[PDB]
Paper text:
A structure of GSK775(B2) in Pf-KMO confirmed that it binds within the substrate site, with the oxazolidinone core overlapping almost exactly with that in series A compounds. However, the pendant pyridyl group does not reside in the water filled pocket as modelled in Fig. 4e,f. Instead, it π-stacks against a flavin group that is now tilted away from the substrate site in an orientation not previously observed in KMO, or any other FPMOs we have found. In addition to the face to face π interaction with FAD the pyridine also makes edge to face π interactions with Y193 and F238. Flavin movement creates a new solvent channel that opens the active site to the protein surface, the pyridine nitrogen of GSK775(B2) H-bonds with an extended water network within this opening. R111 needs to move in concert with this flavin tilt, but few other protein changes are necessary to accommodate this movement. Taken together these data suggest a differentiated kinetic profile for GSK775(B2) and GSK428(A2), with GSK775(B2) showing slow onset of inhibition and slow dissociation, in contrast to the rapid kinetics of GSK428(A2). The apparently non-competitive behaviour of GSK775(B2) can be rationalized by the unexpected slow dissociation of the prebound inhibitor relative to the timescale of the initial competition assay (∼2 h half life for the KMO-GSK775(B2) complex).
Kynurenine-3-monooxygenase (KMO) is a class A flavoprotein monooxygenase (FPMO) which catalyses the hydroxylation of L-kynurenine (L-Kyn) to 3-hydroxykynurenine (3-HK), using NADPH as a co-substrate. We therefore turned our attention to the homologous bacterial P. fluorescens enzyme, Pf-KMO, which shares 34% sequence identity with the human enzyme, but lacks the transmembrane region and had been previously extensively characterized by Crozier-Reabe et al..
Residue numbers in the entry: 7 to 375, 379 to 457
Write the structure that this text describes.
């Protein structure tokens, strides 16, 4: 049997461990954290993720989709909150087949861990990768207390997240051609209790947004009607706008409360533990990291966040990481040798990872914000109705289909260009020749 060592029992690592182990590979998975399945008296994390078609299909191939979805809340659309007006729902898709699912990260990880072990993978927790000796095919791991342990490896998979130790180790043997692009927004997680969400009639079957231009809040529901709120706000106020809100101005929980009372007045009464959450939850960082190289011969490869950290605004980090795990397991299973599998995997996935990194950055303006846009959107809706296999809004191609990300971006561009020229110099729909716009759709967009 072929052997593989995987670093990181996260989302991509555990899925790839299950896929390889059920195909007879000898799989050893190393994880820095403790096993979340061992019940402790600790107060566990309430992180929510939006699972879409790419991630759902990956779980489906692994036989874990039904179990994951039993524990997922349907989000039918985007509920936009602007003070004084009732929330505007905005369906994501055409029917209940075109939805996103809100899943608790810890519930998903336990399912994936059980799945990897059921398939035959051995999982070793409380062991963090420190360094790799590529020449001797040996790695060094340690616990939190610093006690070191060495292990031999044949194939190394770096599924160890955005601050990947495998990626850092690879940089000593190859030029990764690494380009880090920082993002000015930090993030803070806040809670809405089931009692508060019910009292304020917050819809459980939707993704909620409180747009505020340069900053915003989002909320994802849980099975028990609680919601995890995420505030996106600049770490620092720019030089040009020193008065503009930022985390640097929010000195403590009380300042955060004052800020929410002023800027998010319909949201502040639902956040009962705002002051404590603000002070005890750390401010997260966001970034895009692009690498020219994802592998070292046939010895090691990166996937998921280890390969392509992206900004969170499209909810595609996990979906892309799960899609990578399927592609990696497929390439490894059927290749002539590991070196061929890793080069083929990298060549296939890199253009698509670059496309989703770009689309995730573009989605911030779509969430946090024009009559021209409204007319384009209305025309876009008519074209999707008239031509459903040709005109598919970019959000739907990314979220509800498995079309390669680079193709969704290219088609999305043809559509934006088509709508722009069609609405130009028209105040409303009545002056636009709809049949001529439809002819342009049939001429420029091949059916999918
Ligand atoms: C709060 C939050 C919400 C998110 N919401 C969404 C969402 O709505 N939709 C979406 O698609 N994506 C979302 N994402 C992004 C998504 O979580 C990631 O893109 C995804 O988890 C990447 O999967 P991964 O397996 O590559 O990495 P991870 O899931 O981060 O797993 C990496 C694993 O490696 C372990 N590890 C790290 N360093 C070492 C080491 N040196 N040695 C050993 N083990 C190590 C970590 O402990 C972890 O278990 C969210 C991210 C955050 C932070
Ligand atoms: C929860 C996640 O934030 C998102 C998840 C998301 O899922 C999605 O479908 N979208 C787009 C929704 C839309 O355009 O209507 C989306 C956006 C964000 Cl910021 C997050 C929290 C904190 C750190 C990193 N990630």
């Amino acid at each position: 049997a072929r052997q593989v060592t995987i670093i990181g029992a996260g989302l991509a690592g555990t899925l790839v461990a299950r896929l390889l182990a059920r195909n007879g590979w000898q799989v050893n998975l190393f994880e820095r954290r403790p096993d979340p399945r061992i019940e402790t008296g600790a107060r566990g994390r309430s992180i929510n993720l939006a699972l879409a078609e790419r991630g759902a299909h990956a779980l489906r191939l692994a036989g874990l989709e039904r179990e994951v979805l039993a524990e997922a809340v349907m989000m039918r659309g985007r509920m936009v909150h602007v003070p004084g007006t009732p929330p505007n729902l905005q369906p994501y898709g055409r029917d209940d087949s075109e939805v996103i699912w809100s899943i608790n990260r810890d519930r998903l990880n336990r399912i994936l861990l059980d799945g990897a072990e059921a398939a035959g993978a051995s999982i070793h927790f409380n062991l963090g990768l420190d360094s790799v000796d590529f020449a001797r095919q040996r790695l060094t791991l340690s616990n939190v207390s610093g006690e070191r342990l060495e292990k031999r490896f044949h194939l190394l998979i770096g599924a160890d997240g955005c601050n990947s130790a495998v990626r850092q180790a690879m940089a000593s043997v190859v030029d990764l051609g690494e380009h880090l692009e920082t993002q000015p927004h930090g993030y803070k997680e806040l809670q809405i209790t089931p009692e508060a969400s019910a009292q304020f009639n917050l819809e459980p079957n939707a993704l909620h947004i409180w747009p505020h231009g340069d900053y915003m809040c989002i909320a994802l529901p849980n099975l028990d009607r609680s919601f995890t709120v995420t505030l996106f706000l600049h770490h620092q106020s720019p030089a040009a706008q020193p008065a503009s809100p930022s985390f640097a101005q929010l000195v403590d929980g009380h300042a955060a409360r004052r800020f929410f009372q002023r800027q998010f007045p319909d949201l502040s009464p639902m956040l009962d533990s705002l002051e404590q959450d603000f002070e005890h939850h750390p401010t997260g960082k966001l970034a895009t990291l692009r690498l020219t190289t994802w592998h070292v011969g046939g010895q090691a490869v990166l996937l998921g966040d280890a390969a392509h950290p992206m900004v969170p605004f499209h909810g595609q980090g996990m979906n892309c990481a799960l899609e990578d795990a399927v592609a990696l397991a497929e390439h490894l299973q059927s290749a002539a040798d590991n070196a061929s599998a890793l080069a083929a995997f990298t060549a296939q996935r890199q253009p698509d990872a670059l496309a989703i990194q770009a689309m995730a950055l573009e989605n911030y303006v779509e969430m946090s914000s024009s009559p021209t846009y409204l007319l384009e959107r209305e025309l876009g809706q008519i074209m999707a109705q008239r031509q459903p296999t040709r005109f598919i809004p970019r959000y739907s191609m990314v979220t509800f289909s498995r079309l390669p990300y680079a193709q969704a971006m290219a088609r999305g561009q043809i559509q934006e260009q088509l709508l722009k020229f069609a609405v130009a110099n028209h105040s409303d729909l009545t002056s636009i020749n709809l049949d001529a716009v439809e002819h342009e759709v049939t001429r420029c967009l091949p059916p999918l």
